[PDB]
Short mmCIF file of C-alpha atoms in Angstrom, two decimals:
data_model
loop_
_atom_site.label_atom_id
_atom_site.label_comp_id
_atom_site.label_asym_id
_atom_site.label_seq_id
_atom_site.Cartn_x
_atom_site.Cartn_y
_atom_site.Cartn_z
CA UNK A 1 0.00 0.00 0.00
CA UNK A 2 2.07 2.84 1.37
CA UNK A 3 6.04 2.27 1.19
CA UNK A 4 6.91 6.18 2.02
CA UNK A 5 7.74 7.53 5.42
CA UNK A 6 4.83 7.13 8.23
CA UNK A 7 6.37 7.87 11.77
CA UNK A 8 9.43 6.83 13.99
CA UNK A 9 8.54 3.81 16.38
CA UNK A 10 11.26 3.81 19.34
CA UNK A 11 12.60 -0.11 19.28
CA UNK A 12 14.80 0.35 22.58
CA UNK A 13 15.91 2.87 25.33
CA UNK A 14 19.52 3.03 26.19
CA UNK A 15 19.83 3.60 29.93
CA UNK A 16 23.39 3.53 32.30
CA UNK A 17 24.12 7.37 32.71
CA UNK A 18 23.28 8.95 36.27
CA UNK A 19 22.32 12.39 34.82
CA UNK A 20 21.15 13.97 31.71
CA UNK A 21 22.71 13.17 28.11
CA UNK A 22 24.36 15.60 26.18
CA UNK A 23 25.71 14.43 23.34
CA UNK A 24 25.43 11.05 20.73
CA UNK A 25 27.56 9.90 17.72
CA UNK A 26 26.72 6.71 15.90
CA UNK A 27 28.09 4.04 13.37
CA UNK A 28 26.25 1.02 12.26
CA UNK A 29 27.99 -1.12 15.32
CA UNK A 30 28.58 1.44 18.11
CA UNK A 31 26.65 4.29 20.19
CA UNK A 32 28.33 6.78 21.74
CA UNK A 33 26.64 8.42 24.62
CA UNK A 34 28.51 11.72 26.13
CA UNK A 35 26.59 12.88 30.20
CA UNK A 36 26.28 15.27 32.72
CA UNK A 37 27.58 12.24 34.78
CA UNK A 38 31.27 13.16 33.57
CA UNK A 39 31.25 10.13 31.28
CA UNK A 40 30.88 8.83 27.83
CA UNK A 41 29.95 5.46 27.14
CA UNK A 42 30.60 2.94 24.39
CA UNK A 43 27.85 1.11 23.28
CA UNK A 44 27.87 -2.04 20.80
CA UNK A 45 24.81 -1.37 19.07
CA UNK A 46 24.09 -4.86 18.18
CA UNK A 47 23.43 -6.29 21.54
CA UNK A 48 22.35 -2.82 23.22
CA UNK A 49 25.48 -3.40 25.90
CA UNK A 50 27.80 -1.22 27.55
CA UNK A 51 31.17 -1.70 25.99
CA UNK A 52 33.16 0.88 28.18
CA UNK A 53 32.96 4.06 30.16
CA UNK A 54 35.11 6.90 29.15
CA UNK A 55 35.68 8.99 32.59
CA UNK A 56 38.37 11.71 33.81
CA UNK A 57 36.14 14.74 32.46
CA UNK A 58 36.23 17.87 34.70
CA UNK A 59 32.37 18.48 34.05
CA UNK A 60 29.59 18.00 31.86
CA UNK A 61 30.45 15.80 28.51
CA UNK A 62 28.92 18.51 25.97
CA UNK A 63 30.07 17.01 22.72
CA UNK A 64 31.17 13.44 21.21
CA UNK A 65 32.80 12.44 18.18
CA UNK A 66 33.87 9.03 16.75
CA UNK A 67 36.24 8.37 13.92
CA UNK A 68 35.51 5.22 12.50
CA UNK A 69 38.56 4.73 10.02
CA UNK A 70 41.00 5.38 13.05
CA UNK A 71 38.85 3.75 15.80
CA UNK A 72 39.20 6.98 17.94
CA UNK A 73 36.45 9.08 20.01
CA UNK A 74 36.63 12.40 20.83
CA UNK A 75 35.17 13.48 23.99
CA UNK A 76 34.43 17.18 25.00
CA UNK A 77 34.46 18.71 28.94
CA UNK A 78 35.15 22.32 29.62
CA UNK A 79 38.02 23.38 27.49
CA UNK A 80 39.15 19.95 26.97
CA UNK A 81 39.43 16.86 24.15
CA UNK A 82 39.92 14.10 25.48
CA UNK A 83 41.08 11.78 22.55
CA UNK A 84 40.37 7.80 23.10
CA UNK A 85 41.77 4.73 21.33
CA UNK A 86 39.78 1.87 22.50
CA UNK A 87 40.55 -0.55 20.14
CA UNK A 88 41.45 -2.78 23.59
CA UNK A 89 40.64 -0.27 26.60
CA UNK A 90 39.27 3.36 27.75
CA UNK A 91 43.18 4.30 26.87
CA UNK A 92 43.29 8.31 26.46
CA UNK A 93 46.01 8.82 23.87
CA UNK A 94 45.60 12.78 24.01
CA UNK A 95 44.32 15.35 25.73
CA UNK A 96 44.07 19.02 23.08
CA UNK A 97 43.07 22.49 24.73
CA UNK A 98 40.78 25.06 23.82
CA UNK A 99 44.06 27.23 23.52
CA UNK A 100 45.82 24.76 21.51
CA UNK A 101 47.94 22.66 24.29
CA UNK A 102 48.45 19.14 23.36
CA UNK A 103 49.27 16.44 26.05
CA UNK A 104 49.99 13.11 25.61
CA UNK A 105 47.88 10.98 27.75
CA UNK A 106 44.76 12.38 30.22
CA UNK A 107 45.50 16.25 30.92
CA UNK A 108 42.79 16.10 33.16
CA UNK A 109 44.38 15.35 36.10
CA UNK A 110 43.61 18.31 38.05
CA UNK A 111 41.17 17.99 41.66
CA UNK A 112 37.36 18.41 40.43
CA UNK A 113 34.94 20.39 41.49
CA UNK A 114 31.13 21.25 40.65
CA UNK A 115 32.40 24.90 40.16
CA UNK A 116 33.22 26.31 36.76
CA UNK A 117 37.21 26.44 36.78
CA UNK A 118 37.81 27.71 33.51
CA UNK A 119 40.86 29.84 33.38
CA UNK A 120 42.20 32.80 31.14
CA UNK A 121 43.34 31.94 28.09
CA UNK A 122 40.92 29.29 27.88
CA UNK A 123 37.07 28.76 26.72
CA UNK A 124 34.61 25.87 27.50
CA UNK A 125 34.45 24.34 23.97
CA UNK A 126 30.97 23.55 22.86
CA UNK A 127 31.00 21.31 20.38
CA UNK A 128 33.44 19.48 17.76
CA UNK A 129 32.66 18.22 14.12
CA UNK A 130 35.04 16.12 12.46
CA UNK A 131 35.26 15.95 8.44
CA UNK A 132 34.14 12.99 6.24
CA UNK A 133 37.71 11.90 6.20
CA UNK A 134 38.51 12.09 10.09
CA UNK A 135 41.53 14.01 8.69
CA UNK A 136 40.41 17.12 10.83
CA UNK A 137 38.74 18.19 14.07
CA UNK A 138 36.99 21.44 14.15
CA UNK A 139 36.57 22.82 18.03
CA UNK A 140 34.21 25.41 18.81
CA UNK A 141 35.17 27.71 21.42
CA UNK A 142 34.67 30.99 22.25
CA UNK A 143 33.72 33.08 19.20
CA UNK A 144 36.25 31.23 16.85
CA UNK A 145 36.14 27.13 15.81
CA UNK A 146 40.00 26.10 16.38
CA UNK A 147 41.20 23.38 13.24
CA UNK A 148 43.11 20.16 14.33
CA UNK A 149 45.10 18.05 11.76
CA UNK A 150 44.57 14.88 13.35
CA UNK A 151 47.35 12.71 11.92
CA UNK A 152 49.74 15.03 14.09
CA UNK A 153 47.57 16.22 16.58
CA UNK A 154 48.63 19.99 16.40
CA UNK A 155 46.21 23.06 15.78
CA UNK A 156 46.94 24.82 12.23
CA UNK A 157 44.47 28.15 12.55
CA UNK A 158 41.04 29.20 13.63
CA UNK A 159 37.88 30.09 11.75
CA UNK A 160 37.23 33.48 12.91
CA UNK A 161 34.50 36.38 12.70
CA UNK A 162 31.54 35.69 15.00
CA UNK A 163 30.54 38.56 17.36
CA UNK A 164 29.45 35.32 20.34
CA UNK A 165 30.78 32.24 21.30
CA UNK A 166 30.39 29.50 18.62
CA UNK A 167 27.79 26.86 20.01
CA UNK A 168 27.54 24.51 17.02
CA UNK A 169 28.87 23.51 13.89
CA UNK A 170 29.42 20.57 11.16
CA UNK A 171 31.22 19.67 8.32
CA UNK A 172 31.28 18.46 5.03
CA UNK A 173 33.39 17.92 1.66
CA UNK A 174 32.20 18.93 -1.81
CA UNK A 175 35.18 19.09 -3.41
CA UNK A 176 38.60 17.73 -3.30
CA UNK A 177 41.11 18.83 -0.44
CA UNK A 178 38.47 21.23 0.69
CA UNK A 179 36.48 21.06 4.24
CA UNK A 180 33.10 23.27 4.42
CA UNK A 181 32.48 24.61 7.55
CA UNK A 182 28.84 25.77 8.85
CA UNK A 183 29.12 27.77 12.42
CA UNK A 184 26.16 28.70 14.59
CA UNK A 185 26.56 30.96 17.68
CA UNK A 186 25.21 32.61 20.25
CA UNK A 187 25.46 36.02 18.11
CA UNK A 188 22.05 34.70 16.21
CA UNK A 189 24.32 33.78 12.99
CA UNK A 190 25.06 31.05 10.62
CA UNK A 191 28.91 31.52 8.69
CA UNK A 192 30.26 29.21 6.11
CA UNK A 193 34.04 28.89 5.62
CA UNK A 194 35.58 27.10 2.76
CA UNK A 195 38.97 25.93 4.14
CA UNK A 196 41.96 23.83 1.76
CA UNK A 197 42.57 21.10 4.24
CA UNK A 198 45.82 21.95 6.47
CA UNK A 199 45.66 25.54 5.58
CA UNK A 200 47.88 27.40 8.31
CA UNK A 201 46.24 30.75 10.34
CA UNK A 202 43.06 32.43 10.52
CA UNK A 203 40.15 31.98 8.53
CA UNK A 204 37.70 34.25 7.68
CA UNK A 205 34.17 33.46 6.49
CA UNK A 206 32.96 33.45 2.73
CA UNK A 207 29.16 34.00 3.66
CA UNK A 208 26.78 35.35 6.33
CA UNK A 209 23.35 33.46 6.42
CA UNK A 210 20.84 36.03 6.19
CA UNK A 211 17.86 37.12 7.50
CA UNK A 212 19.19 35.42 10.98
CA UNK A 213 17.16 33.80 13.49
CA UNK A 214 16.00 36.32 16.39
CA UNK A 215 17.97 34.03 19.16
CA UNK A 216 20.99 31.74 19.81
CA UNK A 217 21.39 28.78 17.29
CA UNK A 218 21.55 25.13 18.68
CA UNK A 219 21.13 22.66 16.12
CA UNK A 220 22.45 22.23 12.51
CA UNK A 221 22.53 19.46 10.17
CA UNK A 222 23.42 19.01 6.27
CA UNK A 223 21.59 16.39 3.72
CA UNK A 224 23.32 17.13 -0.09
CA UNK A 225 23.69 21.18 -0.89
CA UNK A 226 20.47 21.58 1.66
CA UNK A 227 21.62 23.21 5.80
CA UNK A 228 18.82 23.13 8.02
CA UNK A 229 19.24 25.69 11.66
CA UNK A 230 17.64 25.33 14.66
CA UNK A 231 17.15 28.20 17.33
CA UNK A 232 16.49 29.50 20.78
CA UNK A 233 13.79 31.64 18.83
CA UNK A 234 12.04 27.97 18.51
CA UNK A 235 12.11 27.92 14.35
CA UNK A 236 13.97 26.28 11.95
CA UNK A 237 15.53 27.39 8.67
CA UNK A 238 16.39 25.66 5.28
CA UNK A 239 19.24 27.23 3.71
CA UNK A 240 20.55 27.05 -0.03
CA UNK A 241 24.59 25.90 0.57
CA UNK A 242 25.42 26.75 -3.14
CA UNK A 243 23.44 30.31 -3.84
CA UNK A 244 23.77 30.97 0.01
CA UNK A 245 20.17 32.21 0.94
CA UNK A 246 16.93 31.15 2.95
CA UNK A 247 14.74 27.82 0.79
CA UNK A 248 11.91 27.41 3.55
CA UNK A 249 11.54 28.27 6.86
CA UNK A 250 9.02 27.45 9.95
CA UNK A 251 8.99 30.12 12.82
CA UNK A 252 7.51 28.86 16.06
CA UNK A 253 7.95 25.29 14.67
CA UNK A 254 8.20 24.53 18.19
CA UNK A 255 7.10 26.03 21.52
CA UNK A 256 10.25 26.06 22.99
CA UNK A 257 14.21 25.63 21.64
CA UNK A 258 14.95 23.83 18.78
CA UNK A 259 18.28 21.87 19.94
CA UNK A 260 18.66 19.20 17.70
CA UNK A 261 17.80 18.06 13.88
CA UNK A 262 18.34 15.24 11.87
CA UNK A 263 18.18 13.54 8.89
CA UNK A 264 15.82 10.95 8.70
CA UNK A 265 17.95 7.41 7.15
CA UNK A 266 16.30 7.07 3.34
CA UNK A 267 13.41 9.23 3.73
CA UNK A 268 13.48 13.15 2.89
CA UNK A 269 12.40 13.98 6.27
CA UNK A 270 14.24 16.10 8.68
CA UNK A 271 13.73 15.05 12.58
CA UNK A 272 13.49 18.52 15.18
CA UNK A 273 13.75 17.61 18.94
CA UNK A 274 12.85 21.05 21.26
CA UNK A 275 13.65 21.51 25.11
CA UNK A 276 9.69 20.31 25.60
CA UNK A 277 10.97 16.50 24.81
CA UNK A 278 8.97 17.24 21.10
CA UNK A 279 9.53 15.63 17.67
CA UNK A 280 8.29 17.02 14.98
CA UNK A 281 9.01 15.82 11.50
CA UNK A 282 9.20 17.52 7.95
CA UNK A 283 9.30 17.18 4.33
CA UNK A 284 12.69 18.42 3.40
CA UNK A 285 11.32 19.74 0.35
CA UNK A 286 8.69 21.97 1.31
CA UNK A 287 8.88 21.91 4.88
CA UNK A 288 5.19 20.30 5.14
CA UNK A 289 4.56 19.25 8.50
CA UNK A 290 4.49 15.02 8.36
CA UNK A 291 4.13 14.83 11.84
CA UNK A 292 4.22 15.16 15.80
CA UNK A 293 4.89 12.97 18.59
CA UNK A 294 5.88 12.57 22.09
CA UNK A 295 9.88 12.18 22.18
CA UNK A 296 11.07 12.35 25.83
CA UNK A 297 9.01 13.43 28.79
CA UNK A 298 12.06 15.71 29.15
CA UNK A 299 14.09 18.12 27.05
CA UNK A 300 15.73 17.01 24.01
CA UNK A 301 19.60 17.56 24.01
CA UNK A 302 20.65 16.10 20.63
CA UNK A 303 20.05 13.72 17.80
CA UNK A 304 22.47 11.70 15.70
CA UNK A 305 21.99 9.12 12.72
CA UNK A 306 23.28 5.99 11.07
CA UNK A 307 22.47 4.16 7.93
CA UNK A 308 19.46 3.01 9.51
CA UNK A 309 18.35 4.35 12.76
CA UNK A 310 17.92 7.53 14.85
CA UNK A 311 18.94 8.88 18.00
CA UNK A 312 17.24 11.04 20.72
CA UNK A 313 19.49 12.25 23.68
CA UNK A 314 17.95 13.60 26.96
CA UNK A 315 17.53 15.04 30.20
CA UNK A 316 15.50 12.13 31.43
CA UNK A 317 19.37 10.12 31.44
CA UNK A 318 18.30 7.67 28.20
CA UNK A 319 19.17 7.50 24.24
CA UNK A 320 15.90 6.49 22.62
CA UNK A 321 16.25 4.37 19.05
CA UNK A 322 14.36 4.94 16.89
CA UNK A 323 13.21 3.40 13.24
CA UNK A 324 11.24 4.57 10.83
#
């Protein structure tokens, strides 16, 4: 009868972390699972089991990150990356700073506290994207995303020109040697930067998004030459990547922050999760409305995807699955 996209059924809940959830990143085999509880955890995604716990974070885990060609995670905490190999164990192989600093081993050694500790010359870093190739890391912190050539682990230059501190970003490759950056920040803005991979020094950006969204941006996510935003202001935005303007847009397409989007695997639908534990879902054409449900009975912190499923992070301390 009807072989196009319906609704998302959740298949299984994740559960383990002691406080909220952050932050996911998924392959087709492993969940990864970042926590107010100071942890990350590896997940096989087979069997739904706990694989490891990745600890030693100062603070909240805001941001995770797995490189599947390398068999690395990233984990973010204050103005930390912790970087994991854990091929065989939780073994942190490097710890980068917002400033640049690179330590070999777990930098985070330092007593802990529940007070913010942050010092000058540093930023809390709010989230990381790494490119298709896992070649780069790009580390959002303060009003500048700091670039990372991961096969040396050293910092090469900084994407500059936001007026607030950078909250999200991601990352994608349509040409050869060349990264595509999308920023969102506090400032209300969306940037693009166009960066030759391993380019040294600062970077400024080839094109403003306008009009802006009237609040902070959380959420971003790319499907082909399509960028969809979502905002404090509680709309989302479908932006044009190659003429560089507005395609749709849905203010008030929730009633409170949009702060989280995805892709929908094989369907063009894009998934919005708001801070009322809401998803909505949308043709990515037109923006039609294609539904409304129930996600969490708690906010919505992120969303991730892999070939075939989708992930809901929240306050409520679970990962939902989801298929459609």
């Amino acid at each position: 009868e009807n072989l196009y996209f319906q609704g998302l059924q959740c298949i299984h809940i994740a559960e383990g972390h002691t406080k909220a959830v952050l932050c996911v990143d998924s392959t087709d085999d492993l969940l990864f699972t970042g926590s107010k509880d100071r942890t990350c955890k590896v997940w096989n995604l087979v069997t739904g089991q706990e694989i490891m716990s990745l600890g030693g974070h100062p603070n909240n885990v805001v941001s995770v990150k797995y490189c599947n060609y390398t068999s690395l995670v990233f984990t973010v905490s204050t103005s930390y990356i912790k970087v994991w190999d854990i091929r065989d164990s939780a073994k942190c192989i490097r710890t980068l700073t917002s400033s640049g600093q690179v330590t070999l081993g777990d930098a985070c050694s330092a007593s802990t506290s529940r007070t913010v500790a942050i010092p000058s010359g540093e930023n809390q870093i709010n989230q990381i994207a790494l490119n298709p190739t896992g070649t780069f890391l790009y580390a959002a912190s303060g009003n500048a995303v700091r670039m990372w050539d991961l096969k040396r682990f050293q910092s090469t230059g900084k994407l500059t020109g936001h007026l607030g501190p950078v909250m999200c970003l991601t990352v994608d490759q349509i040409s050869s040697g060349q990264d595509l950056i999308i920023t969102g920040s506090k400032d209300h803005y969306i940037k693009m930067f166009d960066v030759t991979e391993g380019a040294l020094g600062t970077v400024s950006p080839t094109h403003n998004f306008e009009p802006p969204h009237y609040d902070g941006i959380e959420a971003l996510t790319i499907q082909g030459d399509n960028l969809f935003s979502g905002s404090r202001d509680n709309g989302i935005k479908k932006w044009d990547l190659t003429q560089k303007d507005l395609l749709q847009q849905v203010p008030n397409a929730h009633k409170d922050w949009v702060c989280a989007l995805g892709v929908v695997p094989d369907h063009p639908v894009l998934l919005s999760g708001c801070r009322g534990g809401i998803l909505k879902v949308w043709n990515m054409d037109t923006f039609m409305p294609v539904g409304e449900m129930k996600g969490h009975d708690s906010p919505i912190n992120a969303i991730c995807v892999n070939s075939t499923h989708i992930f809901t992070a929240a306050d409520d301390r679970t990962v939902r699955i989801w298929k459609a």
